């Protein structure tokens, strides 16, 4: 079947409405394809230094009959420092009308971070150790393999559609395609790895010119930004003219002229003779005060984010180990399909 969740555009990170526990507590959380692990922020948790963890909403597990608790830690740490601490349990999920049995998630009790997440990656990925390493419980059947599980999808997929940058909502499906926000054919593409959602991107083709690549990327759905390695990431920044400035101890980040010239494109070419063009306003994204970020910066991972994911349509296949791609369309229209 199909379920067509929206994806309010929070500006860096879409979140869908999750209700949890037998009296639906209504959480906003994060969907999150480079995570594999669901957590909310717990009623009663202390949120770090200056955030404010719990505006999106909370969950109480003792107003819950059905909630049961597992009792290993729980923790995580995301590509930004932000990390969360609490502990494991199962309950009832809500989705749009849509609801799975105990279905195994994080109780989180500090949390530096904004929101809950729900991560929907490869059940491989998920985050079952401590810090040293030491494991904390066995991998677990998250969300979209529940789903498959207990019939309320066919296969263990989705596609995602997050609108255009002016846009409000955009949409994730579990099960289903629409085959009307999207030009071309979908390229079904292999992941290349069994762990993270990443493709084999070949080259990029920025202001013209031509950047051989040949390495995989991280189709990520909560980062908001492009990164690259930083010999790449470098070569990128030249030819834009984007100049890396020192703002912590070893973090750098590139700044880039708030006035510099973005009609162009930016082309992404992956295997199959996919391709997929970024419009370059994509890479000037707004501080607060009269500076201007570049939207690709440097790291040790090759993420397409936000600002890329906008201008594709994405029929993610995690039984299959297929992403497929296709050049984006916007419209208020719709057609799917329940692969
Ligand atoms: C203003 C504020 C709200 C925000 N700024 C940002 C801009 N930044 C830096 C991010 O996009 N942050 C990304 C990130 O960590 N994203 C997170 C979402 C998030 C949301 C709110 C606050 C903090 C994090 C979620 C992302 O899918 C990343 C992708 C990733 C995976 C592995 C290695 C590196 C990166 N997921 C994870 O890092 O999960 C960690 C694990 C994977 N497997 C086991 S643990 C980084 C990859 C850059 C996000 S939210």
Do not use: M
């Not at 395609?177 to 070949?202: C, F, P, W």
Request: aromatic residues 10%; contains cysteine; glycine residues 10%.
């Amino acid at each position: 079947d199909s379920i067509s969740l929206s994806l309010i555009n929070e500006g860096p990170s879409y979140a869908s409405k999750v209700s949890v526990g037998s009296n639906k507590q209504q959480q906003t959380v994060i969907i999150d394809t480079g995570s594999s692990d669901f957590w909310v922020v717990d009623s009663n948790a202390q949120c770090g230094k200056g955030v404010d963890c719990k505006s999106s909403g909370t969950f109480t597990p003792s107003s819950s009959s059905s909630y049961k608790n597992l009792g290993a830690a729980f923790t995580i740490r995301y590509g930004d420092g932000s990390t969360s601490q609490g502990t494991w349990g199962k309950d009832t999920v809500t989705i749009n009308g849509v609801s799975i049995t105990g279905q195994q998630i994080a109780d989180v009790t500090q949390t530096s971070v904004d929101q809950g997440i729900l991560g929907i990656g490869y059940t491989s990925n998920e985050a079952v150790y401590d810090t040293s390493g030491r494991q904390t419980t066995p991998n677990y059947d998250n969300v979209p393999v529940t789903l498959k599980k207990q019939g309320k999808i066919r296969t263990n997929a989705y596609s995602l559609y997050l609108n255009s940058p002016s846009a409000e909502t955009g949409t994730i499906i579990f099960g289903g395609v629409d085959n009307a926000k999207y030009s071309g054919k979908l390229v079904a593409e292999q992941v290349t790895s069994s762990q993270a959602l990443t493709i084999s991107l070949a080259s990029v083709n920025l202001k013209g010119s031509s950047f051989s690549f040949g390495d995989g990327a991280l189709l990520d759905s909560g980062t908001t930004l492009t990164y690259f390695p930083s010999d790449f990431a470098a070569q990128l920044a030249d030819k834009a003219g984007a100049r890396l400035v020192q703002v912590a101890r070893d973090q750098y980040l590139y700044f880039i002229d708030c006035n510099t010239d973005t009609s162009g494109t930016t082309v992404f070419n992956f295997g199959n003779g996919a391709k997929i063009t970024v419009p370059n306003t994509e890479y000037v994204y707004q501080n607060g005060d009269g500076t201007c970020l570049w939207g690709i910066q440097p790291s040790d991972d090759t993420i397409l984010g936000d600002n890329f994911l906008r201008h594709a349509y994405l029929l993610y296949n995690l039984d299959a180990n297929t992403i497929s791609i296709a050049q984006v369309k916007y419209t208020t229209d719709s057609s799917i399909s329940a692969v």
